[PDB]
Amino acid sequence: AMKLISNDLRDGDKLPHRHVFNGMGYDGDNISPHLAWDDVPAGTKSFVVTCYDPDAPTGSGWWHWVVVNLPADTRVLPQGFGSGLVAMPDGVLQTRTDFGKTGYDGAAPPKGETHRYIFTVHALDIERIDVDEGASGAMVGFNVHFHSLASASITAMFS
Amino acid sequence: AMKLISNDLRDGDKLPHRHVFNGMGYDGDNISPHLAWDDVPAGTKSFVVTCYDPDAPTGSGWWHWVVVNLPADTRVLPQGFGSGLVAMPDGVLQTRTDFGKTGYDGAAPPKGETHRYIFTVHALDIERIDVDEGASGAMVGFNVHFHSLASASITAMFS
């Protein structure tokens, strides 16, 4: 029964300022949160980690961060993994977000709105998904849908 | 009361093969459908046209086609406008789809599934949205949400 925990986030609590966006009217530190998981399914060959806001009023939500092809032995993403603080393990790729770039960028909702910022880890049954860094969050999501063995998430609320 | 019509599509009917994707197991012609609109709101300064599948199992649906900054006098997109058959009017941009490129690419659902393929035209209150060709459908959608005066759509069902 795969579990996702974090030294930074608490499921259902407010997203700490450390992980809020640093512009667009906000002044958060824009650092990806620590994430750690356990009890993965047998047959796991890689992981995908994402940050998605289902409440962004765009017609398709908003992908904040997408990490693919994490090797089967991965059980943690240190704080700042999506922010240039951590070396990328071989074969890992950070793919394209709705901000038109790769890597993590935090919450920055319309002033006064509170959205869900869902951090999810998916265990896949394939070692590598066939994508490059220009792949959209939906394109990764398509691959996740057909290859997922299990998932676990933590949702942080912002504002 | 803005209306959207088409020489090719009929709201609620099957998407013709001419507009289905040409690969991924399908052999449609992959040509964008004709779209035409009328009775636009006063204050309209530009239009955005999109094709979205809310039923794609990706976590965020799928953006098939996004066209922005169509001038205020636009009332039609000839067949193939998103397929290289039509010259781009000055200032018009086709932005990034979930297929990781610009331009129209048609329906190609999981074998045997029937999804909605929604074609929408939005009348905006601003002449240009500040995006380049790398902007995601959500990024365009964010701009549409804050600038839309009205919208009209036609939904085609595929398979």
Put simply, the answer to whether B100 touches A59 (Cβ < 8 Å) is: no
Q: Which residues have CB under 8 Å from B31's CB, separation 6+?
A: B18, B19, B79, B80, B83, B85, B104, B106
Q: How far is B16 from chain A (nearest CA, A)?
A: 24
Distance CA A49, CA A40 (A): 14
Backbone dihedral angles phi then psi of residue A144, each to the nearest 5 degrees: -60, -45
Shortest CA gap A106–chain B (Å): 15
Strand partners, B67: B49, B94
Query: Distance, in angstroms, between A123 CA and closest chain B CA?
Result: 15
φ/ψ of B105, rounded to 5, equals -135, 135
B115, amino acid identity: H
Chain B residues with CB within 8 Å of chain A CB: 50, 52, 56-63, 96-100, 134-139, 141-142, 144-145
Closest CB from B63, B99, B134 relative to A60? B63
Experimental method used, please? X-ray
- Residue A3, H or E segment: strand A3-5
3-state class (DSSP) for residue B58: coil
User: How far from chain centre, in Å, is Cα A141?
Assistant: 12
φ, ψ for residue A124, nearest 5 deg: -105, 160
Tell me the torsion sign for CA atoms A125, A126, A128, A132: negative
A148, closest residue in chain B (CA to CA):
B58
Two structure tokens written together for B73? 């006098």
Number of domains chain B contains: 1
Q: What is the CATH number of the domain that holds A117?
A: 3.90.280.10
Contacts of A99 in chain B (CB under 8 A): 136, 139
Token pair listed for A99: 């901000």
Resolution of the structure in the document, Å: 1.7
Q: For residue B63, give how far its alpha carbon lies from the nearest alpha carbon of chain A (Å).
A: 9
Residues of chain A in contact with residue B48, where contact means CB-CB under 8 angstroms, are: none
Round to whole Å and give the CA distance between B2 and B9.
Answer: 17
- Domain span at residue A86 reads 1-159
Contact partners, residue B158, CB within 8 Å, separation at least 6? B14, B15, B20, B107, B109, B114, B115, B117
Q: Which residues of A1-29 are buried (b: 16+ CB within 10 A; e: fewer)?
A: ebebebebbeeeeebbebbbbeeeebebe
